[PDB]
From Swiss-Prot, chains B, D:
One of its GO terms (biological process) is defense response to virus. Keywords: Antiviral defense, RNA-binding. It holds the Pfam family DevR. Part of the aCascade ribonucleoprotein complex, minimally composed of Csa2 and Cas5a, which binds crRNA. Other possible components of aCascade in strain P1 are Cas6b (SSO1437) and Csa5 (SSO1443), while SSO1399, Cas5b (SSO1400) and SSO1401 have sometimes been seen weakly associated. Csa2 is probably the major RNA-binding subunit. The Csa2-Cas5a-crRNA complex also binds target DNA homologous to crRNA, probably forming an R-loop. Purified aCascade forms a filament about 6 nm in width. This is CRISPR-associated aCascade subunit Cas7/Csa2 2. The keyword RNA-binding applies.
Curated annotation (Swiss-Prot), chain C:
CRISPR (clustered regularly interspaced short palindromic repeat) is an adaptive immune system that provides protection against mobile genetic elements (viruses, transposable elements and conjugative plasmids). CRISPR clusters contain spacers, sequences complementary to antecedent mobile elements, and target invading nucleic acids. CRISPR clusters are transcribed and processed into CRISPR RNA (crRNA). One of its GO terms (molecular function) is RNA binding. This is CRISPR system aCascade subunit Cas5 1. Gene3D superfamilies: 3.30.70.3120. It comes from Saccharolobus solfataricus (strain ATCC 35092 / DSM 1617 / JCM 11322 / P2). One of its GO terms (biological process) is defense response to virus. The keyword RNA-binding applies.
UniProtKB/Swiss-Prot annotation, chain E:
One of its GO terms (biological process) is defense response to virus. The keyword Transferase does not apply. Keywords: Antiviral defense, Toxin. This is CRISPR type I-A cluster 2/Apern-associated protein Csa5-2. It comes from Saccharolobus solfataricus (strain ATCC 35092 / DSM 1617 / JCM 11322 / P2) (Sulfolobus solfataricus). CRISPR (clustered regularly interspaced short palindromic repeat) is an adaptive immune system that provides protection against mobile genetic elements (viruses, transposable elements and conjugative plasmids). CRISPR clusters contain spacers, sequences complementary to antecedent mobile elements, and target invading nucleic acids. CRISPR clusters are transcribed and processed into CRISPR RNA (crRNA). One of its GO terms (molecular function) is toxin activity. The aCascade complex was purified from strain P1. The gene is csa5.
Swiss-Prot record, chain G:
Probably oligomeric upon overexpression; does not interact with a Cas5 (Sso1441)/Cas7 (Sso1442)/crRNA complex. Forms dimer and tetramer-sized oligomers when overexpressed in the absence of CRISPR loci A-D; the oligomers are probably responsible for its toxicity in the absence of CRISPR loci A-D. Part of the aCascade ribonucleoprotein complex, minimally composed of Cas7 (formerly Csa2) and Cas5a, which binds crRNA. Other possible components of aCascade in strain P1 are Cas6b (SSO1437) and Csa5 (SSO1443), while SSO1399, Cas5b (SSO1400) and SSO1401 have sometimes been seen weakly associated. One of its GO terms (molecular function) is toxin activity. CRISPR (clustered regularly interspaced short palindromic repeat) is an adaptive immune system that provides protection against mobile genetic elements (viruses, transposable elements and conjugative plasmids). CRISPR clusters contain spacers, sequences complementary to antecedent mobile elements, and target invading nucleic acids. CRISPR clusters are transcribed and processed into CRISPR RNA (crRNA). It comes from the Archaea. The keyword Lyase does not apply. GO terms for biological process: defense response to virus. This is CRISPR type I-A cluster 2/Apern-associated protein Csa5-2. It comes from Saccharolobus solfataricus (strain ATCC 35092 / DSM 1617 / JCM 11322 / P2). The lineage of its organism: Archaea, Thermoproteota, Thermoprotei, Sulfolobales, Sulfolobaceae.
Length: 131, 316, 211, 316, 133, 131, 122
DNA sequence: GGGGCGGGTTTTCCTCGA
C-alpha cells in the first residue's frame, strides 16, 4: 500500500510537470529535506492540476493498453499526453505526509518515479512527431 | 538391547591429539574419498577415536557406582583401568589365579564380584588358562558426516607464546570445528550374567541380587557420553558442543539404526525396525527421537526434548 | 546347495591385524565372515568346551563357505593397519548346505560387526535361493584360492596369506594358505577377473569361485 | 560446582594478537560451522583465546592472596606463571625434586603449601617421577553468537603514522567489533585437596585449616573475569564492554549450561537442571540469572542486578 | 532472463550517459553503491544527462543493420559519433531494477561492469578508426 | 571462438598486471571458485586499464613482428611493454561470463595465459636492461 | 615429467623467500600443509616477500655454460639460487597437483630447505 | 526560452627486537 501511495503521488507530479512544462516542482520535491518543502510542492502541483481540470485540459479517462486501465489525459501547448494510473486521494496525501514525517526518502522515490513517467511520455511524443 | 545414533556439532575443539613433531601438537585425521563430476578427491578429515569415549564412560560408571556402594576394585578406584590382566594386578587386589580350565568360571565369578568395571567393561587375563569377557558397551569412531558434495570440517594451527623476563617459549596447537556423528550399542540384558559354560558356582545369588543395580548404573553412565564429558585439553581448550539429532531404539532382539551420514536416516531406520521385527518374531520395539535441525521423522515415534527424559524412559 | 546374499553398510571400516609393527589386511578373511554368522546363534558365550580344549564358540560353523567384496572406495592407512571406507557397502555371499534356508536367513540378519568392536556394520537387505554348479569360463569379483588358474591379463592381482579353521583354538597357529585378491592398492576398489576354475556356483550372475 | 554462561558486547576491540606480516598487526581468527536455512556453511571469524582469560584470573588471584595473607610463590609473585615445570624454578623456590613414585605426594604437598596458584590452576613436573595436577578452573575460547544466518561480527584494518621532523613510521592495526559469548566452570569441592593417591603426609592439617580461605579467594577471583579486566593493548585501544546476559548454576553433580548461541538458553538450561537433579539423585541445585536485554527467562528464578551481588551470594 | 534483460537495458543507459558526458563518475558511483540511495541518485543523474542529449538532438534512437535491424542509440559528443546497440530502460525496468537493488545491491555492480564494457569497446573502435584515417 | 575470447581476456589481465605491477588481480582470477570473484576482477582490471587510457599510458597500436599485428603499448614506472593482440569487447566479456557460469575452469585458463604473457615480457625487458 | 620441473621451480621460490626473509616459517608451513588452503596461503606470502625484494632491488634475476639464477641480498649477505622462479602457469599447475596430492608441497619444501642449507653452509 | 568556461592534487615514511 505504501508503494501504491508513492506511485499515485508520482502520477500527480508527472501530470503537473507535463501540463506546466516545468520540472521546478519535481526538482523541489526530489531535493526536499523537510516536510515543509514536500507539503508546499503537494499544494502547488495540485493547484496547477486544478487549473487544468477547470480548463478541461486535464481529465480522467480509461485506456485499453485488452483491459481498460485508469488514465489521465493532459493537453499542453497543443501536445497530448496520457499518464496511466490514478491520481492520489486526500487519504493518500495524508498517509504520504505521515511517511514523509518518518522519512523524507519517500519524496525522492516519488520524484524519481514522476520524472521517469514524464521522460518516457515526452520521448514517445517526440518520436511520433518525427515519424 | 539399546541402540543409538547421535549427531553432534562442535566448534573450536582439540580433544584427541597424536604424536608430537618438533614443537607442534597434531590432531587425529583420516583419509576420505569424495566423488566429483571431474573425478575423485582425497581429503584428510579430523576424527576422534573410540578409546577416549570408553575411558570417559568407565570413569563416569566408577563415579556413579562408588556413590551407591557397589564394589569397586583397588586399581580401578584410581583412574587406572589396567584391570585384572597380569599377576601383579591380581597381587594388589588379592585374588588367586585360576587353577585349570574347569575352574575358570569360578575365577570369573570371583573377579565379577570384586570389580563392577571388570563386568560391564570386560577384562582379559593372559596366562596358562586365559579368561575372556566381551564389553557390554560398544562404541565407534566419531567421524563427521559425509553428506552432499562438501565436508563441513576444518583444521588450523594456532601459535602460542609464554612470557618470560629473561629470554634465552613457543608452541603450536591444532584446532578444529566439525559436525560429528556417532553410534553405540548396549545390552542391559546380559549384565550380571557369566560368560562361560559349566556348572553353577557358589556366589551367583549375589550377582542375581545385584543385577538390577548394575543395570541401572550402566544405563545411568550413558548420560555423561550423551552430554559431552569426553576427551582432553578441557582446561584451556574447552569445546562448545550441541545436540542436533538423536535416535534411540529399544528392542528384545539384535538391531542397529542407520549411520547418521545422510539427511534422512530416521525414516529408514524406523522402516527397517518394522521389517526386522516382522521377520525375527520380536515382541518389544520402541523408538525415541530428538530433532533439532528440522529433518523428516515419520510416524509412530515418541518425541522427547532433552536427554534426561531419554534416560528416565530407558530406565523405566 | 543353498546360497544367501547380504548387503552391509559400514560405519568407518574394518581392522584385522596380521599374525606374527602391526600391519593389517586389505579384506576380511573367511574366518571373520564365519564368526560374524555364528554370532547370531552363540551370543553371550565366549568359551565352549570343544571336547579337549577351550578354543572358541565358533569351531562348529567351520564348514560354511563364505566370500565378500567391496562396492565403494577406501584407503589403507597405518597409524595398527586400518582400512577406512566410511559409509561404504559390503556384499557377502554365503554358500552351504548344513542348515535349511530359514536358519541361514535368520542368522544372516544377526550380523553386528566384522573384526573388532569398533567395526560396526548395519544390515540393509538379504536374498536366499538355490545355487547351480558350473565349470565353464566365468568372470568373478570375489577373491579365490591361489591354485586357481587365470586366463586374463595379470594386472590387478595381489597375494595374501590366510589361515584355516585350525587357528580357532588359543595357543595354536593356523595353517598358512595363499589367496589371490583382485584389488587395486590405491585407491581401494574391486575389479573383475576372468577364471576357468573347476567349481563355480551361480548366485545371481556374479559367479563365485571356490576351486 | 559453579558453571556459568556469559554474553558480552564489545566494539572497537583488539585484545588478542597473532604473528604480524609486514607493517600489519593481525587479529586471531578461527573457522566456525554455522547452520542456515540453506544448510551448513564455514566462515572465518575473529576469536579470543582462553589463555589470556586464565592469565587475568591468575593475576587477580595472586593480588587477592597477597592482600589476604595467603602464601604466594617467589616466581609467581612476579606475574610469570612458569609454576614448577622446569628445574630452574625448583632451584629458585628451593624445593627438592621427587626421588621415586612413593615420594610424589610429598612433593605435591610441598608445592601446594607455598603457592595458591599451583593449587588452583594445577601444575606439571616432568622427570623421573612426573607429577600432574589438573586445573580447578576451566575456560574456553571466546566466540561470537552463531545466531540466525548473519554473524554479528566485523573486522577491519586501521592506518597510523608516527610524527618526525626529519623523515628518512607507518603501521596498520586490526580492529574488530562483535557480540562475544563464553562459558566457564569451577569445582570448589576439590580446592586444597591433594590429588595424587598415597598415604597421609604431615602438612595436610594446614591445608585443611586454609581450605576455607582458599575457596573464598578462588570465588572472589572470578570478579575480574566477569567484569572485563583481560586482554592486551589496553593503553591505546581500551574497549567498550557491556554485559547483556549471565546464567550461573551451583550444583552438587556435574552439569553444563547451554551455550549462549540461541536467544532462548535460560529456560532450557533451568528445565535441564531440574530434570538432571531429578534423575541423578542430587541434593542441591541453584540458579542465578542476570538479564538486561528483555529475553524470556521463566518462573521461580532469582533475578539479580549487578555482578557484585552474584559474587556475594556465591561467597555466602 | 527478464532480470538479465533489465540489467542489460540499465547498462545501455549508463554507457550512453558515459559516452555523452565523457565522464566515468556516474558509472563509478553506480558500481561502488552500497545503498539504494546511491543507485537511485545515479539513475536520476544519468537520465538527466540523457534528457539534455535528447533535447539537443545529440542522443537519438535508431535502427542499425549489423542482416536484421537492431535497435540502437546514436550519441554525438565533442564531434565524436558513437552507437550503442540495444534499448534504453523503460520506467518499469527502472522500477523493477530498484526492487532488485532493494533485495541485492550486487545488480548495480553487474550493470556497471556491463556499461563499462560497452563504453570501452566503443571507445577502442572509435580510436582505431581515427588512427587508420 | 571460445579460445579467442579466453586469449583476449588473458591480454586484458596481462595489460592490467604490467601497468599496475601487481599480480593480485591475476591471482584472484586464477583462484576463483565463483562467478562473483571472476566478475569483480573483470571490473577491477578494466578500471586499472581505464586509468592508463586516461593518462595516455595505455594505448592501442600496430606492430610489425612482416605484417602488422594489433598490440597494446603499456608505460609503467618508466618501463615500456608491448602486449600483442586485441583487448576483449563488451560481447567477449559477456560471452566469457556465460562460459564461467557453465565452468569456472575458463578463468584458470585465462589466468595461466595472462601470467605467461606478463612473464615473457618482463623477462625480455630485464634482459635488454642488463645488456 | 615436467611435474619435477614445476616442483623444482616452486622449491627455488621457497628457497629465495627463505634466504631473503631469514625465516623458515613459510617453508615449515608448506612442508606441513594438509590442505590446498595452507599451500596457497604460503604461495602468496612467499611471492609477496619476493615482490618486496624485487621492488628494493635486493632480489634480481641473473645468469651465472650460463645458467639462470636469482641473486638475493639479505642483511649484507649475498646468496645466489641457481634455476628459474615459477611462472603463473607453474603456480596454477602446481595448485592442480596439490588438489590431487598435498605430497608435492612436502617434496617442494624438502628441496627448498636443501637449496637454502647448501647456500647458507657455503 | 531548458546556459557557457578554467580546474578531478602535489613529499614523506612501507617495522625494529627476544
Amino acid at each position: 500500500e505504501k508503494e501504491n501511495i508513492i506511485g499515485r503521488i508520482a502520477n500527480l507530479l508527472a501530470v503537473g510537470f507535463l501540463y506546466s512544462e516545468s520540472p521546478t516542482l519535481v526538482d523541489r520535491f526530489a531535493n526536499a529535506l523537510s516536510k515543509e518543502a514536500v507539503t508546499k510542492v503537494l499544494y502547488d502541483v495540485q493547484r496547477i492540476v486544478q487549473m487544468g481540470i477547470d480548463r478541461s485540459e486535464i481529465a480522467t479517462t480509461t485506456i485499453t493498453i485488452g483491459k481498460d486501465y485508469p488514465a489521465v489525459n493532459v493537453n499542453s501547448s497543443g501536445a497530448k499526453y496520457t499518464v496511466v494510473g490514478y491520481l492520489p486521494t486526500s487519504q493518500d496525501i495524508e498517509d504520504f505526509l505521515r511517511m514523509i514525517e518518518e522519512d523524507v526518502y519517500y519524496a525522492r522515490k516519488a520524484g524519481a518515479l514522476a520524472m521517469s513517467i514524464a521522460n518516457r511520455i515526452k520521448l514517445g511524443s517526440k518520436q511520433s512527431k518525427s515519424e | 538391547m539399546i541402540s543409538g545414533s547421535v549427531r553432534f556439532l562442535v566448534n573450536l575443539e582439540s580433544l584427541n591429539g597424536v604424536e608430537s613433531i618438533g614443537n607442534l601438537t597434531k590432531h587425529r585425521t583420516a583419509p576420505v574419498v569424495l566423488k566429483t563430476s571431474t573425478g575423485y578427491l582425497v581429503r584428510y578429515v579430523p576424527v576422534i577415536s573410540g578409546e577416549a569415549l570408553a575411558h570417559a564412560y568407565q570413569a563416569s560408571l566408577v563415579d556413579i557406582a562408588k556413590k551407591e556402594g557397589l564394589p569397586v576394585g583397588s586399581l580401578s578406584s584410581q583412574y587406572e583401568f589396567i584391570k585384572f590382566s597380569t599377576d601383579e594386578a591380581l597381587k594388589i587386589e588379592g585374588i588367586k589365579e585360576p587353577k585349570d580350565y574347569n575352574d575358570a568360571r569360578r575365577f570369573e565369578v570371583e573377579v565379577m564380584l570384586k570389580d563392577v568395571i571388570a563386568d560391564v567393561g570386560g577384562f582379559m587375563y593372559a596366562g596358562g588358562a586365559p579368561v575372556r569377557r566381551t564389553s557390554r558397551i560398544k562404541l565407534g569412531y566419531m567421524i563427521p558426516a559425509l553428506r552432499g558434495d562438501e565436508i563441513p570440517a576444518q583444521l588450523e594451527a594456532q601459535f602460542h607464546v609464554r612470557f618470560s623476563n629473561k629470554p634465552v617459549a613457543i608452541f603450536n596447537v591444532e584446532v578444529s570445528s566439525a559436525l560429528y556423528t556417532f553410534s553405540f550399542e548396549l545390552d542391559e540384558d546380559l549384565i550380571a550374567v557369566p560368560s562361560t559354560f559349566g556348572e553353577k558356582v557358589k556366589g551367583e545369588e549375589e550377582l542375581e541380587r545385584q543385577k538390577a543395580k548394575r543395570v541401572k548404573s550402566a544405563i545411568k553412565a550413558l548420560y555423561s557420553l550423551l552430554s559431552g564429558n569426553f576427551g582432553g585439553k578441557r582446561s584451556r581448550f574447552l569445546p562448545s558442543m550441541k545436540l542436533m539429532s538423536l535416535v534411540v531404539t529399544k528392542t528384545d532382539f539384535p538391531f542397529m539404526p542407520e549411520p547418521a551420514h545422510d539427511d534422512d536416516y530416521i525414516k529408514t531406520t524406523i522402516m527397517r525396525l518394522g521389517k526386522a521385527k516382522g521377520v525375527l518374531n520380536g515382541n518389544l520395539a520402541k523408538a525415541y527421537v530428538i530433532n533439532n535441525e528440522g529433518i523428516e521423522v515419520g510416524e509412530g515415534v515418541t518425541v522427547l526434548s532433552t536427554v534426561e527424559d531419554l534416560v528416565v524412559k530407558l530406565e523405566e | 546347495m543353498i546360497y544367501s546374499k547380504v548387503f552391509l553398510k559400514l560405519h568407518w571400516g574394518f581392522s584385522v591385524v596380521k599374525p606374527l609393527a602391526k600391519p593389517g589386511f586389505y579384506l576380511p578373511p573367511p574366518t571373520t565372515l564365519i564368526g560374524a554368522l555364528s554370532y547370531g546363534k552363540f551370543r553371550g558365550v565366549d568359551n565352549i568346551n570343544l571336547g579337549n580344549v577351550y578354543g572358541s564358540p565358533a569351531y562348529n560353523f567351520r564348514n560354511i563357505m563364505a566370500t565378500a567384496r567391496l562396492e565403494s572406495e577406501g584407503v589403507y592407512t597405518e597409524d595398527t593397519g586400518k582400512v577406512y571406507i566410511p559409509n561404504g557397502r559390503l556384499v557377502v555371499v554365503y554358500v552351504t548346505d548344513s542348515i535349511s534356508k530359514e536358519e541361514l536367513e535368520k542368522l544372516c540378519w544377526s550380523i553386528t560387526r566384522i573384526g573388532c568392536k569398533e567395526c560396526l556394520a548395519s544390515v540393509e537387505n538379504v536374498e536366499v535361493g538355490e545355487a547351480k554348479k558350473v565349470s565353464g569360463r566365468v568372470k568373478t569379483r570375489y577373491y579365490f584360492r591361489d591354485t586357481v588358474k587365470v586366463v586374463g591379463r595379470k594386472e590387478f592381482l595381489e597375494y595374501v596369506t590366510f589361515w584355516e579353521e585350525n587357528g580357532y583354538i588359543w595357543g595354536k597357529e593356523g595353517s598358512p594358505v595363499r589367496y589371490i585378491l583382485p584389488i587395486t592398492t590405491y585407491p581401494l576398489a574391486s575389479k573383475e577377473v576372468e577364471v576357468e576354475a573347476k567349481e563355480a556356483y551361480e548366485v545371481g550372475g556374479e559367479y563365485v569361485v571356490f576351486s
